[PDB]
């Protein structure tokens with residue numbers, strides 16, 4: 001039993017809800033919140049900009065030190081950093097950004113990072129401003145993640161479409 005509330009169950013391990021991931025994380029304080037990161041951990045917009053803003057820029061400060069030490073992530077890769085006031089940990093995961101020409105096949109690799117954590121709050125990778133079809137992202141999530149994932153979909157109209165079209 002966990003404290004996630006109001007989710008629709010899609011499969012044995014995947015749940016989905018129309019919610020603002022920032023407000024959800026503040027309420028649940030999950031062990032792991034997933035950020036929709038880029039390789040530079042520059043948290044400008046989308047989910048990343050919103051999470052970082054909610055940390056009063058502490059996420060960005062921590063991220064800049066991470067990059068200065070380690071260099072950029074790989075597309076499809078991840079790193080674990082602090083969750084600040086939102087969660088114990090933040091798993092920064094880089095899905096392909098179609099608006100940069102990146103290979104959508106890397107979306108499965110991106111979701112594989114979730115399997116290193118028993119329970120996660122997460123957005124749909126590569127959706128929104130990353131330019132991929134959210135229906136496809138949800139399919140890859142369900143077919144790749146085996147741990148317990150709670151998906152927050154910000155756009156209510158998109159949430160209804162994802163549920164109604166789910167196979």
Ligand SMILES: OC[C@@H](Cc1c[nH]c2ccccc12)Nc1ncnc2[nH]ccc12
Nearest residue numbers: 020021036046047050127128129152154
């Ligand atoms: O809109 C699709 C969806 C996934 C997404 C990944 N990256 C993005 C970059 C820009 C815009 C959107 C995205 N957005 C969100 N889903 C849940 N909570 C959210 N809080 C703030 C935004 C947001």
